[PDB]
């Protein structure tokens, strides 16, 4: 899809997920964007 | 991470580490300004 999905500055319309609580059952859709806390602290913050 | 004197940019000090357990847990305890932005691996994974 180089001919149809190419842009000089790079398209940001395409995203993917890297972190979540656990794996996915077959044919499961996840749309949630809630923050993912990892170490110990409660986060609940936009970044950090 | 607690060495008294660092090295010049052109003569960076390199240390090889092997034959240990790697407790990345005690790395995230400093007064802010802590830029941690990796590549090629999940921050989480690192520990497995």
Key terms:
little secondary structure, 48 residues, flat, viral protein/hydrolase, part of a larger assembly, 2 chains
Radius of gyration based on Cα positions of chain A: 16 Å
Shape type of chain A: flat
The class by helix and strand makeup of chain A works out as little secondary structure
Number of separate strands of chain A: 0
Instruction: Indicate the multimeric state.
Output: part of a larger assembly
C-alpha end-to-end distance of chain A: 36 Å
Q: Which sheet architecture does the biggest sheet of chain A show?
A: none
Helix share bin of chain A:
under 10%
Question: How many DSSP H or I helices of chain A?
Answer: 0
The fraction of residues in strands of chain A falls at under 5%
Largest interface, with counts of residues having CB < 8 Å to the other chain, equals:
A-B, 4 and 4 residues
Protein name (chain A): Spike protein S1
Region (Immunodominant HLA epitope recognized by the CD8+) (chain A): 11-19
Organism (chain A): Severe acute respiratory syndrome coronavirus 2 (2019-nCoV)
Region (Disordered) (chain A): 18-48
Q: In summary, what is this structure?
A:
Chain A has 48 residues and is low in regular secondary structure. Chain A is 0% helix and 0% strand. Chain A is flat and about 45 Å long.
Structure report:
The structure is cut from a larger assembly and holds two copies of chain A (48 residues). With 48 residues, the first copy, chain A, is mostly loops. Chain A has no helices and no strands. The termini of chain A are far apart. Chains A and B meet through loops of A and loops of B. Chain A: This is Spike protein S1. Chain A: Residues 18-48 are annotated as: Disordered. Chain A: Residues 1-48 are annotated as: Receptor-binding motif.
